């Protein structure tokens, strides 16, 4: 897993149906870092330091063995300052 | 952001879950929570149509199994001018 | 019959001249008063419980004082919970194609007109 | 005493009967009546734990058959200080 | 008067019928009409003990077939002084 | 903390019991009690995540067999700033 | 005209229909509309006795199948003065 | 009030219960308890006739199943002056 | 302590056993022993409610088979103020 | 010797016999004879437990066939202080 | 207060839960924890009678499900002075 | 007195109840409580023969259904000088 | 050798001691609410 | 932190495994290991509520199959001050 900070939300109205209704968040390891997008399965606010799982697991955390996700937020770390 | 998203639930706990989800999912502004009566709580968010869509969807899924659950999740993209007088302009 | 402290414990005392689940299943029980007034657990000793001999305070003592009539009036609940199983019109489906994020396996989202969204 | 007893009934008549009974049965003070919504009325008394228990059992019995009757009877011997903010101080 | 008579009905129309019947039947002062919630209405009358008895009988008889009917008719001859705080003094 | 813990119960006795258990169990503060209508009452606590989790579990057990019961118990670890507008800050 | 005519309906639409009907049928004045709670709305008309009778009947007939329907259609030719405190004077 | 309500019981425990019940039940003042011999104990209350009726029914009901129970329950609505001489004037 | 527990026995031996039991079992004060007549003897304890309840249970059990036995065991948690005048305040 | 021994008999002749028997039989001191009423007379001895036990057996068998006989023969080994207030200290 | 409440459990985790529950539920002071041997741990609380009652009930409800459970819940309301030597005054 | 009475119970709660009962019943001194091992607790009282018999019987009757119960209740009237070396002098 | 009553009291003996019904969680929200693990309890005996 | 987590296991090997796991999973202090008797061993840790929760769950999962296993795993987020006196402060 990786520790990254949610920066903002991401809206893609033309997403695949398989993606479901699940929310998507723009997450970076640090500010000024490569930005990745994660399905949020926890309910995470911007500025949160969160735990993001890798690919097969991401799908299952995101909701199914056959879900289209390669990065899902699985927990918010209670105290972390990066 | 002139679009409207509303989620209605049986209870306030599902509504707070819905609102949280919505506002977290997309850039929408919660503009109201209304106690309809009878246990119906409606939470309304306003934003761009895509944003509102996303928000409502995440919210409906989130609140569905919380408490007594979702009654309705509705998105109205262009809201008529008349309807705006009945819609809350800021949360209370 | 000389009653007294020596009529106690018959069969449990030796060396004498002559010899020579505490708490009830929860599912089964619903307490009249809950909280610290619960009676599920068997608290032995000098507890605040009142037996068959004891009369007073609660059973007919409170229920008699004031006269009452109840009526079999028409009870119809109008509430969100009561309307959970209200009959509903047929659920809207989507015939749209193109990438619409058309999830059909989730909750019902509706759009203007009642359209599935 | 600082214990709390509560009777919740469906309707006010059952509750008033309950309150009367509770205060007459033991050394308790009525501190409130609240209309919860949806025809639930809660009558709350404070006093010593045993007194409170007695009072609550009595109120329960008195009110069970009045009107639509009893929903709940509960006793809390020590109330956390936070809970006291949501609890009514004197009857209104 | 010391005595209290309370009639609880489902709906206001039965309650008004009951109040009228109570107030006409005997010398009782109407001290409150309470919309409890859920459609329950309680009409409360105060008077001397014989008067309250008459009044409650009359009121119950009146309201029973009107509307959704009577939930409770209750007479309390001396209400504990504590209970007097949760009771209305004049109808509002 | 910014975690929110919410319990919905049918009636106020269950809710007061839930708040009590919650507050006693963990370092959470009761920021409100709400009557939603229909008899749903929601008690809302706030605190850090572990605290909130503990509290919500405790509250739920406590309130389940009291009255008409528990409708929902929910934990939201981080609450969006927008949701905070519709959330109570002090019990009142 | 001191007579009271009262129609109670489940929901406001049936009641507005009832009121309209009553007032069109007879020389009665609408003195009030009340939300009892739980979905009951009572619409009240005052007038001379024959007028009130005609009106209430018209109103009932009109509202019987509108919405969720009628609960009570009642007439009281002279209300006791005590009751008049609980009855609305002007519609508002 | 000058009515007299009297209750006779076999034994003193039933009589104390009766006295308590009567005094709690309605607006009557306890005037005395007399031991008659043979185990009969008589408790007397004074008040208005309605009050006395209520109180006495209540008292009889209370003592009947307590101890050896009730021998008699009687109400004299106006007591002759000569009789007042043999009546206890303040309790014990 | 406000509460009253009373044991009635046929004879003094049963009463002494009951009293000893009561007094030993819990913190109560024997406030009276009375010879009613006819051989009824009443022994009376005052204490806080839980104490009184324990004491009466104990005394009753004890005296049931001592002598001619128990007639009555009764507990009144708060007695009306008037009933106090007829109650013994010290054993003689 | 702090134990108590008690014999209750129907009538005084059997009681004097019992007291005489008891005192003669063992090292007990007679502390009282009381007329309970109804014909019950209680004679009471104090002494050490073995003595009291001997003396009560003696008294009982002595008075059983004298007169109307024995009602109770009972031994309390340690007597509570409260009870000592209701017990005769010295005979006559 | 001098009443004693004791909960006996199999194991220390259940007992600590019991102590915590007991101390939170009522105004009782923990006086000891003892390891009896064989895995029995007894936790003892002192307080006024009603407090003790509440605390013990609470503690048992709390510990029944933790671990291997509760062996006993007991209240000794007035505790003889001799026993105080075996009982632990302040916990270790 | 040199008589010894001993009650063995499984666990401390039963033993403490036994001690209380014994001490309350007769003039015996608790001279010891021992934790034997395996969950057994022995409570030992010394006094005079009759007193010890009374006390042990009382104690047994008390602890039998408390906790895991009574293993043994025994009385030894005079204990040999050699067995006094193994017997606890003071309840420490 | 005498015959004596053995009621072995021990953790091992009590392994099978009769127990109350185990706690369940009706909580919702992300709380790491695992259900397939060993019983963990919180205050009041609630599953945690 | 002030939360307490405890694991009681049958045997020391399971407990050492649990303690290791707990201390490893989160930032918690092992404040004690106690041998209760009969083979119960209890390992107790302190820290923040989240830390304690993580630790206890981890430890539990670890020891369940080691040895004779887990008896109990418990977490208390707020410990009453009174309980602190029976809890170890450092591991000895």
Residue numbers in the entry:
A (entry chain P1): 1 to 82
B (entry chain B1), D (entry chain C1), E (entry chain D1), F (entry chain E1), G (entry chain A1), H (entry chain H1), ...: 6 to 97
C (entry chain X2): 712 to 731, 773 to 869
M (entry chain X4): 822 to 869
Publication excerpt:
Carboxysomes are specialized microcompartments found in all cyanobacteria and certain chemoautotrophic proteobacteria, playing a crucial role in CO2 fixation and serving as a central component of bacterial CO2-concentrating mechanisms. These organelles encapsulate 2 cargo enzymes: Ribulose-1,5-bisphosphate carboxylase/oxygenase (Rubisco) and carbonic anhydrase, using a polyhedral proteinaceous shell. Self-assembly of the α-carboxysome is mediated by the intrinsically disordered protein CsoS2. CsoS2 functions as a linker protein, connecting cargo enzymes like Rubisco with the shell proteins.
For instance, heterologous expression of minimal shell protein components derived from Halothiobacillus neapolitanus, including the hexameric shell protein CsoS1A, pentameric vertex CsoS4A, and CsoS2, allowed for the construction of a T = 9 icosahedral α-carboxysome shell with a maximum diameter of 36.9 nm. To address this issue, we reanalyzed our recently reported cryo-EM density maps without applying any symmetry (C1 symmetry). Fortunately, we were still able to obtain maps for the T = 9 and T = 16 α-carboxysome shells at resolutions of 2.77 Å and 3.71 Å, respectively. The construction of structures using C1 symmetry maps yielded T = 9 shells with a diameter of 36.9 nm and T = 16 shells with a diameter of 49.2 nm, which are virtually identical to the structures obtained under I symmetry. Nevertheless, in the T = 9 C1 symmetry map, no redundant density was detected, indicating that high-symmetry processing is unlikely to greatly impact the structural building in shells with smaller diameters. In summary, we show that excessive averaging in the highly symmetrical processing of α-carboxysome shell cryo-EM data can distort local densities, potentially leading to the loss of key structural details.
